[PDB]
Symmetry: D2
């Protein structure tokens, strides 16, 4: 009947805005304690406070810059002083540095790998303790349709979004004996506040790629993450769920 996560603690990286924020709010709506992260601790704490006021949940904001190992490990010291541990991890944080391939600087490439892959690696390693101990955990990695299709100007980003699938399937196999389930969600074209910057022409060209004829909302992505964190997904691990309105 209902999906309840009262008593669970969910960490959602890069959740001060956009899809990450929608994911944190969705988990909060189900009763989860939530941990909000951003490159600004002030903004993360502000967002946590707004979520706590809206849904009445225990919420904590931490500064976490996924470019920095020191920032990540320091964030976890603050986290483990506030909660017993983490039951649910959503590896949402990610960046793009879009350039045509020959025009892509080494820094453009390495930053995208550092955040999207190495950041995910470090955050996941940091989050497993309570999950392994109690033989229950959910890790949800946010991929992208472009990890599957490829995309012009995003060889770096697409490499990471595809790489997260290998990450997901391998980690799922390793953690399966401990009942810690590791899955991916691969959104298509999602409307966020940043969509407002696109021209009506190209925005229409994008919508034309989508059988449903509309962009998805951040909440529609968040709904699938919630499913994966719920008792409805107890036999799903090593899987990617595409959420793209029929594009792929």
């Amino acid at each position: 009947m209902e999906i309840k996560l009262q008593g669970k603690v969910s960490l959602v990286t890069g959740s001060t805005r956009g899809i990450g924020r929608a994911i944190a709010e969705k988990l909060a709506s189900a009763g989860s304690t939530v941990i909000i992260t951003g490159t600004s601790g002030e903004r993360a704490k502000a967002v946590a406070e707004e979520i706590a006021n809206k849904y009445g949940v225990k919420a904590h904001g931490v500064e976490m810059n996924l470019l920095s190992e020191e920032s990540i490990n320091k964030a976890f010291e603050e986290i483990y002083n506030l909660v017993d541990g983490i039951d649910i991890l959503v590896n949402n944080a990610g960046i793009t540095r879009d350039k045509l391939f020959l025009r892509m600087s080494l820094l453009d490439w390495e930053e995208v790998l550092k955040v999207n892959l190495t950041g995910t690696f470090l955050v996941t390693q940091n989050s497993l303790r309570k999950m392994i101990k109690q033989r229950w955990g959910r890790i949800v990695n946010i991929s992208s349709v472009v990890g599957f299709t490829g995309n012009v100007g995003q060889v770096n980003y697409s490499t990471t979004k595809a790489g997260l699938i290998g990450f997901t399937k391998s980690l799922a196999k390793e953690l399966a004996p401990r009942n810690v389930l590791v899955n991916a969600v691969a959104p298509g074209f999602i409307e966020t506040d940043m969509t407002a910057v696109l021209s009506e022409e190209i925005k229409q060209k994008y919508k034309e790629q989508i059988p449903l004829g509309r962009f998805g909302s951040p909440e529609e992505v968040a709904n699938v993450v919630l499913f994966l964190c719920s008792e409805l997904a107890s036999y799903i691990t090593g899987e990617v769920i595409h959420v793209n309105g029929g594009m792929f």
Copy 2:
């Protein structure tokens, strides 16, 4: 918070036992009116009555032999006299006729295609009316991990379970403009009452293919079908969700 299907009508083919029955009970548990089908009308009506008593839902049983077009169309005449129409269709019904390839009779092959593919085609065609009219519908096709991996002795069955993926992706594109979402669920190794017939040795050999180290329950499959019928899956169409404990 909750998944409610009160006011919806779900048809689940081949739902007098096993996974099909678990799917019908799960939808019933969420408040859906359910239609139960089997090759025996008496058994289908008996199962419907048991489900109605357990969950308190409106339930109807119809005889439907998916080997027969006449049986299917006749079943729908009874259905449309009992309900306004169908909002949710789960194409669960399927058969195997396992033979090594050179040893497979034409009837072994054609029966499997007739039920698994043509039966699905006919049931789906029969069920769309209300969905298209109201611009809301969910069709869930039950595939199998073997549609993806292949399996010795099941060239016929695997052909159909793979074919259902093409069916799903094509139909999803056609119906997307009407907001009728078409998806597949691909179970792995699921424990049913028929599992009791296997030797402990081979049953163990199967479990060894599964990272979670256990067979899934019919209810765990039913849970994923429910997700696809719920408001949590509003941006998912043309997708297959694997439910196999990490096998694939």
Copy 3:
């Protein structure tokens, strides 16, 4: 450097189009070829043309994949002409394009019977020599739309996806006998049928339709020594 002299290849539906290109490609590598079509006279004429062009042993047989009887008769003839088949290319296929809501049972069932059941029966009849000698290649022609789906093609896409399950399963069964089973999935290919139609082309990064010979070349690769460790695979 790819030579198939001494091999016998059966290519179904090879009187025209991609099928003809595959048969000519195999012939160009030295294979004996068996051409099939719904018209035995046409199949024989095409075989004669290929034999004249490439200098190979070529035979034409009538084979209508809708009919078990047609298939049986064709194989009786085949096995009176060759010792057996080393290479099978399941190319024969049909479309009956209709929006799902306008699709008849016949629109559906004919496409399955030819594309799946015809393939099944042809394949069953083609394995004897391959299993005995522990060498054989079966190549199933699928389609990109089996993977992506396509509007107006729920029936065809079902069959082309189904052929993937068929390929993977059969590959597993035959692998102990070193009989390799693979699929080729062409995108948009310029054939005789294309002339009766820029748009579809906009979906293609290469910005052009493929030629039948380009598909044929991939079939040739799969029949070659270069593909000795590939089985249960789809080449797009």
Copy 4:
């Protein structure tokens, strides 16, 4: 029938194993070959051996994929030896196998830096001639474990899956210039490293490990005229 005379192929990490087999295969088809290894002396020795065996123009260069400086120096040398590169085989790769819960940041970061970032930089440096002439082949060596995942290999599997995104994206960007970008995903292959290990073999329908030459043959196909309509594809 596959000839690469006049073509120049760069094969990274080709002093031994699958890399060496690929370089020898290309050489056997007539390609000029560039051999790389972390040891320039070893790379040069292997190039000399290949040149002696096949009669081709072969060059060995030191290239350590961890170091941008090493890569730059190697390409400076390369472009003083050849007009440019027509074929690139991104073969170089490392494993640092550890259970995830025992994996160090270095176990992780080294594997990404070599397998992904090294591939990135090598590829950027190899495109000039291909784009100019509107012909080129880039073949990325992935692995079955990129698709299935593997216990003890979360780092390696991440890179091998990532190379698929890399392949598909780069293929889309380069397709207008007719530069084709594909991946080969080997299963379990018997190499020099195998001897230090029936089980893994039980997962293989063919019931045997593949040879390095069998992988090399598929790379050769992708570099050939037979693969002219294949781009953004993985061959397993």
